[PDB]
Design a binder for these strands. Structure first.
Ligand SMILES: [Ca+2]
Ligand SMILES: [Mg+2]
Length: 430
DNA sequence: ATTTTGACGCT
DNA sequence: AGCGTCAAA
């Protein structure tokens, strides 16, 4: 009752760019705008592998991981943009730089946590409080929320999408308690006003559209963000959680999309997130561990406490290349040449990072996959990263992995290498 | 023969 | 330190 917490203390948003790499290429090449389009890496094998897909192309069934030749089978007029290749490998610089454009705009509004190349969490709690004081008890107009969905509404006693959106928004605003600056629902609504402004700024200043979720924590904000895509935002209130979760597959919640989620389904014999409420905290801890158990117990009730970390920059800078099937690296010369290519791209990115961000990486992590392993990485070794020098970095990576060569022969490498990975880590201020 | 990334937990 | 899990384009 009165001491039972409800996880309504914060306002958190998750902003996610729509079909991000596609939008970067469409900004650059107007011929691709408003077209079924995809971004591919490496044309030679089956037309290249698709990594991003415009919504027009998704309507034909084109997806990520599809080979372009197969996507062309689904969408004969599919347009393609290729990832740049440098030093023999795909180079993602253009997308990292576009990401920086968007992150810097978001940072003007509030503290952000960079969650991936195209998404960031936003802690809006303080901005909401300040805006509520500026408003001076003044009601919130639907005009301030032109692209917002209220999850769960309309409800109770129009057949077009925008009509439904406006009906739900009207019901929500009609109900709000604006005279109470401490109402969680009002705080979320002001949060949504701010996110509308943030999203307008992103589009004005970059050309890129995005979707967003607004709720009381990161998991619900991420879930909300995905409910109305593209170019829309969704408010998930605490009160919307019981109905939302009653038919929500467990795997849709962040961190439960893999083995743990599968084990929750199998061990408990349930399918939907809401069904978790019927277990005690200790029961969940017994099956899934203390940390996971407590997390599940609170999360199925819509409560999560993970903070929006103040971190706009990535914590690691990495480069990797797969060598699939018959192209696996089988000679010492091959392994060293590709370590050099990787180290050169890495030196370039590290030098840029040092100039822009006043920091230096101090550890180099080397990872390889050997032919036969189902595991993504077969081996990981580290060494000191003392100079941004590609020849030195490539020499050190070879030195720390050379003893993996089973081969009795001088020049040959066995078992062949199907992956090389260099990652600069452990940044210190400079 | 999705590939190329990034963060974080366990022991 | 090294391995495993989960997730983004
Ligand atoms: Ca996205
Ligand atoms: Mg994303």
């Amino acid at each position: 009752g009165p001491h039972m917490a409800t996880g309504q203390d914060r306002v958190v948003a998750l902003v996610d760019m729509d079909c991000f790499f596609v939008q970067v290429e469409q900004r650059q090449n107007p011929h691709l705008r408003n077209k079924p389009c995809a971004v591919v890496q490496y044309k030679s094998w089956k037309g290249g592998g698709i990594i991003a897909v415009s919504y027009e192309a998704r309507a034909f069934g084109v997806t990520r991981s599809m080979w372009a030749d197969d996507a062309k089978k689904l969408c004969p007029d599919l347009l393609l943009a290729q990832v740049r290749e440098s030093r023999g490998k795909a180079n993602l610089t253009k997308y990292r730089e576009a990401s920086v454009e968007v992150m810097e705009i978001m940072s003007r509004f509030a503290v952000i946590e960079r969650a991936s190349i195209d998404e960031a969490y936003v802690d809006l709690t303080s901005a909401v409080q300040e805006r509520l004081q500026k408003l001076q008890g003044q009601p919130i107009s639907a005009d301030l929320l032109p692209s917002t969905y209220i999850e769960g509404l309309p409800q109770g006693p129009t057949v077009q999408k925008e009509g439904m959106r406006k009906q739900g928004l009207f019901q929500w605003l009609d109900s709000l308690q604006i005279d109470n600056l401490t109402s969680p629902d009002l705080q979320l609504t002001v949060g949504a006003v701010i996110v509308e402004e943030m999203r307008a700024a992103i589009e004005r200043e970059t050309g890129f559209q995005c979707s967003a979720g607004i709720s009381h924590n990161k998991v619900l904000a991420k879930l909300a963000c995905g409910l109305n895509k593209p170019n829309r935002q969704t408010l998930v209130s605490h009160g919307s959680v019981p109905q939302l979760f009653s038919q929500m597959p467990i795997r849709k919640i962040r961190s439960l999309g893999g083995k743990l989620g599968a084990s929750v389904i199998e061990i408990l014999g349930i399918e939907y997130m809401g069904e978790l409420t019927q277990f005690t905290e200790s029961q969940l801890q017994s099956h899934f561990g203390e940390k996971n158990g407590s997390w599940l117990y609170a999360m199925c009730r819509g409560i999560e406490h993970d903070p929006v970390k103040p971190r706009q920059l990535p914590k690691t800078i990495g480069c990797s290349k797969n060598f699939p099937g018959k192209t696996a690296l089988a000679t010492r010369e091959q392994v060293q040449w590709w370590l050099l290519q990787l180290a050169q791209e890495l030196e370039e990115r590290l030098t840029k990072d040092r100039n822009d961000n006043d920091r230096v990486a101090t550890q180099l992590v080397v990872s390889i996959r050997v032919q036969g392993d189902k595991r993504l990485s077969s081996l990981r070794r580290c060494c000191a990263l003392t100079r941004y020098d590609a020849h030195k970095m490539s020499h050190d990576a070879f030195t720390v992995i050379k003893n993996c060569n089973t081969s009795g022969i001088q020049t040959e490498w066995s078992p062949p290498l199907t992956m090389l990975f260099l990652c600069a880590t452990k940044f210190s201020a400079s």
